[PDB]
Amino acid sequence: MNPKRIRALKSGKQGDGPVVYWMSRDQRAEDNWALLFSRAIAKEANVPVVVVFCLTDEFLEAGIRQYEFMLKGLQELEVSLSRKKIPSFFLRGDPGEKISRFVKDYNAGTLVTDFSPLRIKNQWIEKVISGISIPFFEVDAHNVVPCWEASQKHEYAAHTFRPKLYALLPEFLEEFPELEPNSVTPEVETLSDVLETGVKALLPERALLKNKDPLFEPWHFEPGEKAAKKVMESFIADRLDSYGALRNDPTKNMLSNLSPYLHFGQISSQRVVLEVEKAESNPGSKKAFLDEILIWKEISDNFCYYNPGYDGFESFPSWAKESLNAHRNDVRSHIYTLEEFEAGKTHDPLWNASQMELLSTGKMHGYTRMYWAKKILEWSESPEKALEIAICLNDRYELDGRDPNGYAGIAWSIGGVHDRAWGEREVTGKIRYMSYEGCKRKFDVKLYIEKYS
Ligand X SMILES: Cc1cc2nc3c(=O)[nH]c(=O)nc-3n(C[C@H](O)[C@H](O)[C@H](O)COP(=O)(O)OP(=O)(O)OC[C@H]3O[C@@H](n4cnc5c(N)ncnc54)[C@H](O)[C@@H]3O)c2cc1C
Q: Which residues are annotated as a binding site?
A: 243, 256-259, 292, 363, 369, 394, 400, 405
Which residues in the chain have their C atom more than 2.5 Å from the N of the next written residue, marking a break after them?
187
Query: How many other C-beta atoms are found inside a 10 Å radius of the C-beta of residue 79?
Result: 10
405 near ligand X, rule: CB under 6 A: yes
240 near ligand X, rule: CB under 6 A: no
Considering only residues 35 through 94, tell me which ones interact with ligand X, judged by CB under 6 A.
none
Is 249 within 8 Å of 445 (Cβ atoms)?
A: no
Residue 425 DSSP label: B
Toward ligand X, which CB reaches closer, 98 or 263? 263
- Kindly write out the interface string for residues 343-372 of this chain, putting x where it contacts ligand X by CB under 6 A and - elsewhere: -----------------------x--xx--
Identify the CA nearest to 205 among candidates 60, 422, 378, 101. 60
Beta bridge partners of 53: 23, 90
292 near ligand X, rule: CB under 6 A: yes
Q: Which of 110, 285, 394, 428 binds ligand X (CB under 6 A)?
A: 394
Q: Measured in whole angstroms, how far is the alpha carbon of residue 260 from the centre of its chain?
A: 8
Q: How many residues does the chain have?
A: 453
Query: How many other C-beta atoms are found inside a 10 Å radius of the C-beta of residue 448?
Result: 22
CB of 235 to ligand X, least distance (A): 7
Toward ligand X, which CB reaches closer, 106 or 306? 306
Edge-to-edge strand ranges of the sheet holding 6-10: 6-10, 136-139, 110-114, 19-23, 49-55, 88-92
CB of 306 to ligand X, least distance (A): 16
259 near ligand X, rule: CB under 6 A: yes
Toward ligand X, which CB reaches closer, 94 or 384? 384
Q: Count Cβ neighbours within 10 Å for each residue of 179-192 and write b for 16 or more, e otherwise.
A: beebeeebeeeebe
Sole window of 24-32, 58-66, 187-195, 404-412 interacting with ligand X (rule: CB under 6 A): 404-412
270 near ligand X, rule: CB under 6 A: no
Q: Which of 88, 116, 256, 428 binds ligand X (CB under 6 A)?
A: 256
Give the H or E element holding residue 7. strand 6-10
CB of 434 to ligand X, least distance (A): 11
Q: Which of 63, 406, 416, 429 binds ligand X (CB under 6 A)?
A: 406
Identify the CA nearest to 75 among candidates 228, 221, 190. 190
297 near ligand X, rule: CB under 6 A: yes
Identify the CA nearest to 360 among candidates 403, 392, 399, 405. 399
Pairing of β 6-10 and β 19-23:
unpaired
Considering only residues 98 through 117, tell me which ones interact with ligand X, judged by CB under 6 A.
none
| Number of chain residues interacting with ligand X (CB under 6 A) | 28
Toward ligand X, which CB reaches closer, 112 or 417? 417
CB of 384 to ligand X, least distance (A): 16
Identify the CA nearest to 21 among candidates 143, 136, 180, 189. 136
Residue 137 DSSP label: E
245 near ligand X, rule: CB under 6 A: no
434 near ligand X, rule: CB under 6 A: no
Q: Which of 300, 323, 361, 428 binds ligand X (CB under 6 A)?
A: 300
What region does 85 belong to: left with phi over 0, alpha with psi -120 to 50, or beta? Answer: left
Sole window of 158-166, 205-213, 255-263, 314-322 interacting with ligand X (rule: CB under 6 A): 255-263
Q: Which residues are annotated as a binding site for FAD?
A: 243, 256-259, 292, 363, 369, 394, 400, 405
Is 26 within 8 Å of 74 (Cβ atoms)?
A: no
Q: Which of 144, 400, 429, 430 binds ligand X (CB under 6 A)?
A: 400
CB of 256 to ligand X, least distance (A): 3
- Kindly write out the interface string for residues 151-190 of this chain, putting x where it contacts ligand X by CB under 6 A and - elsewhere: ----------------------------------------
Which 3-state string (H, E, C) describes 185-221? CCCCCCHHHHHHHHHHHHCCCCCECCCCCECCCCCCC
Sole window of 1-9, 48-56, 294-302, 343-351 interacting with ligand X (rule: CB under 6 A): 294-302
Toward ligand X, which CB reaches closer, 97 or 292? 292
Residues near ligand X, by CB under 6 A? 247, 255-259, 262-263, 292-293, 296-297, 300, 366, 369-370, 373, 394, 398, 400-401, 403, 405-406, 408-410, 413
